[model samples]
Target chain A: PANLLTSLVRAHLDSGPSTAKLDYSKFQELVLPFGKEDAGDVQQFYDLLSGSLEVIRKWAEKIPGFAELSPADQDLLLESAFLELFILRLAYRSKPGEGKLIFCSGLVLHRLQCARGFGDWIDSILAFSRSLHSLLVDVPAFACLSALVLITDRHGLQEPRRVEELQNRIASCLKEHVAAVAGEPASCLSRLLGKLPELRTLCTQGLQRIFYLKLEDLVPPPPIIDKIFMDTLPF
Target chain B: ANLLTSLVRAHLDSGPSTAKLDYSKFQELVLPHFGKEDAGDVQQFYDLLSGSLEVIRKWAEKIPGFAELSPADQDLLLESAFLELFILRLAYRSKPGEGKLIFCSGLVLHRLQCARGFGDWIDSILAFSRSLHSLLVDVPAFACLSALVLITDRHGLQEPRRVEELQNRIASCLKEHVAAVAGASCLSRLLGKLPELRTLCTQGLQRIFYLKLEDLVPPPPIIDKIFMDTLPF
Candidate 1:
């Protein structure tokens, strides 16, 4: 049954990226049109940020048992893990050697362009991407890792016991996949979990960048960004 | 908002936290939580005598996400927040100027009734009680503050990040509770109470330390562990 749960998730991730009718010019509403120096990178990044969140929301609903949680739990999980999930998806899709990053709108950009908007965060992002690549984590292992990131020990859970049980089920699936296929088991589980702190660090760094921009008042963040920021703990 | 209010009410009702104080509940049925090593050891200061600690522990269990934390975190939060909770409930239960103090075990005594046990800390406690009583905080916000106090940043926490999340969750709830009440926007002063509670909690530890030094009566087993964990340090 646990393995059954794991396969269902793999199939979803395996469904691969879809091209949505995301109007590429969505950033036009912000302010101006200019080169990489005209704050164009930040606008492009915000447009892609909202674009990626659109993909993430649908992806989460397809997650087993996710939609059934109380609306508060769903909201909390999404807002809390948004940056972490964004990082995971980016690191997964991009090839470090080629320096190409793909957005949900299916447009791709290289390192210098991403850094213009993403700032130094792209550096840390690609570093973590390299780290994950070293694991050679196939679809199933990585899928469970993303699922576990959202499901475990969130602070505001209305039914924490319910979430804990779900996490245990997914973790069971992950442990089975690791020992059965990943081969060199030298506590493969701990190695995966050990990276979460790094994820958390990256998690806050992006939020911090978001806030610094908000203070500069160059352009208003989308309404959803404000909601995410409100729910997020500044510390 | 009604949903949040009731859930909070239900949890308090599950234990000693919200019950009214009366004699027999204190005398016959409930006071044993305050009883001690020897059958007759519980006496004049029954509140502090057996440490009068179980109700606070039970109160902690009623907090929504509390037990989901690690046992080490549970102990640290409890150890860190114990005195603050003791003061919080005491402030909530005591009458403003009537000189009445109600202990969690349902035992009722006047503020002056246990003056000797508190030392100089008693005056500071009365001041806080006056402030809390004036705030017009209803049950939901009161329960939330209690939760927030425990979930705060504390040393030796094994799951520090988890603790931070829980703290923010309760804070969000508290803000929502206050916002709906229309009174939330007006209570900038209410947030100031946290640091005051910290100062008062240290005062409590100092009182316990001085009493421990005097060695007039032995400290209870529970308080001894809590006593050593933080130094008002």
Candidate 2:
């Protein structure tokens, strides 16, 4: 019986950053050209934004049953959850107290660096990050939460049953994990699971940010970024 | 990592063990419908279940992080994933189109010998085995996969985070092997089988649940424990 779980446990330990204490300094920087400083910056945020997208595809690829999804569903799940994951991973890696936003690809930036581009959504994400980091989510637990964010009862799924079942399995794992934590009340599970959808409004904020950028028409949004915007749709 | 993969594969390939089955909780409720001659095989079927369970337990203890877990947590994982691992280990060990079922404990029996005990469940398992074998999943991938089945998730975890961390390593290791050997395409096919495997696992539990409720033949202590701990309702 324990044989069943031993393999998954071992696999997680070897995959990548099993612990949250990853050395951010070793990873390449998404440094913004701060010449406008005396004032601000933007390109590095977009670099981090576009850069983070490709990185997650590999991350999503490793998520056990993710590749099993039909390509459309694969795209839909990744596309719909795009900003949500970005923000969640961002929030997870960020040090809000220090005003740093860590991008998924391991780049770090000050909130001030992206303020010009992220205007409306900047403070909101930091606030969410502040709340989330305070919880001290373990990496594996956060790993499960990250998976559940991408896998849920999403509309337009080619196979809704598969998605829901996957959601249930991941959800069950998270619940069991939360239950095992000695002090936290059982309500803590709900709070964490609920925290995923809390990003919905925030994702909508992202949709608007992209929309605003597209209208400004200075730095063209990456084609994938546009798709993320389009997939987020009619918010 | 290669050493880790090899270690798991080597443990899985070992033939049988001398560990005694703790039939202290063995029961007659395994099946009352069998004739006395058939009942003899029920004893054998129970033999396979409990004996194979020991084999799985030994294999689990050697897994990278299994020993790191608390005894209570270790027990929770084993009990929850027994049926799933049973199916997985069976899938990898059996030959295609062969009617023989290989119990990890080294007992070899024909499908007919266990029909009364396995019932509708055997067909599903054999089919799953065929599907898995078709994927030609090598030992390393299958090794990591077997660990994943048990380590992935269980209902009552004492240290879910610790278990989850192990899960991450195994999944990544599996991913690394699958990515290189099977190339990109087959890994996805292999992943699809996980949910299918879980579905098959659920039915096996349902099969055991009925056998327990019928209580015509009492189940073994560990059998009853695995069934109780693993069952959702």
Candidate 3:
């Protein structure tokens, strides 16, 4: 749940504030935890740091200063809250596994590049990401893991390259920006990109017969669950 | 000391002691004691147990070894506390006749302590007995039970009409916040336990809500059982 919260905040930040409406009220709320004026060029900061969460902050840290805002424009947080909530619900539903972290990281970077335009695209992408993310993330992670395996096994696809490609493409579409694919899970990378055969088989079987969803669609081969380089992840 | 011993002796003679008690017999003989008025007493007990469980839960989290237990184990010990009273309420209602032979009293507390594996475990039972208490005693549980029971008893309320019409009303009322049930406070009424209760309650009201009752006999109770079980997963 804590990771979920962090990921939601990360998703919104990555949604590119410059490209959409710069909800002053929301902007304030998002950065208020870190204090005003001190947050620095809010848009660029959000853009630059949206995807990669390298910094660690202690919970005990407090705001340096508190500047009160006027009461006239308070309902403004609704849109931002909607975006954040969508991210939470979607990420949980999506169950990106290691890919979720990557997709989130990518969105952070995408927002940095584009949020400056701050127009309709932001709203559209945010809405799209939220809706789709909820569909995928809201389901249990284990369920999603199963879906991935089923897709891979059914598709007759092997190797991390295909999945990695798919995740990045979807993420790029989400951010509305094209970026390079990110690296594999540490476990995969260390094992020389080979599938963890036994674990993969078990996880795939578990996922294929999962009851989380049943839809009329073409089936693909079950995927091998292993570490890889640059997995595709839709935010 | 003598007075306490005498009181214990008198209690044992009239009341079955734990050693001599037969679980099934006690259920058959005493469950009918769960009268409508006892609903309130059960609620009173629930509130006390709920608070105590919350305290236990908080401490459970703080303890070093608590998380080592499996989810099912945690459910048995921790989640059980939260729903123990609710389960007991149902168990009591499940008895023969109209009741379910539910365990709502010593049964719940004993089960809680028993799972922890301390005999004379009653020795560890130190609850804060309040000088004064409050109760929200109601047949709220029976609201669901009756919805099902009445349907079963009379056998008329099965597979009734217009699910879409009901869903339509549900959808309209949902968006009509202020017009229907306003504010965050009234966004929704308590979601009653039985799914069929709400389903049939709406159907019954919709059908006969405004109609004349002269032609109507008591509706036969529907046939159904509430199920709680572990998923094969």
Question: Taking the tens digit of each residue's C-alpha lDDT, what string does model 2 give over B4-39?
Answer: 565466565554443522324333233334322344
Give the per-residue lDDT digits (tens) of candidate 1, residues B1-233.
Answer: 55356447744663354345554423212222211123223234434534445666766776767788999889889877888878887777776587666666666665544555665566687788998888788888877777787789998889899989878888888888888777444357777686777778767765565455445566676777786766321
lDDT of 2 by residue, A1-235 (tens): 1221233343334433423645446333344544332212345556667876776777777666778889899988988887898888888877899887766544556776667778758899999999888778776578788878888867878899998887777767766666667464346666677687678767866765665455445666677887777656532
Q: Against the hidden reference, what TM-scores do the models get?
A: 0.46, 0.44, 0.21
Residue B164 alpha-carbon offset, candidate 2, angstroms: 1.8
* Native contacts recovered by model 2: 0.00
Tens digits of per-residue lDDT for model 3 on B1-233? 23223322322232223454335422222222211223233333334334434443443443223345444444344432233223323333222232222232233332222211211111212110110001221232222221222111111212223322333433333344334322322222323323423323332222221111111222221100011121111
> What TM-score should be assigned to candidate 1?
0.46
Computed on C-alphas against the true complex, the DockQ of each candidate is 0.01, 0.01, 0.01
* Stronger candidate by TM-score (2 vs 3): 2
lDDT of 3 at A46: 35
The positional error of residue B21 in candidate 2, measured at the CA in angstroms, is: 19
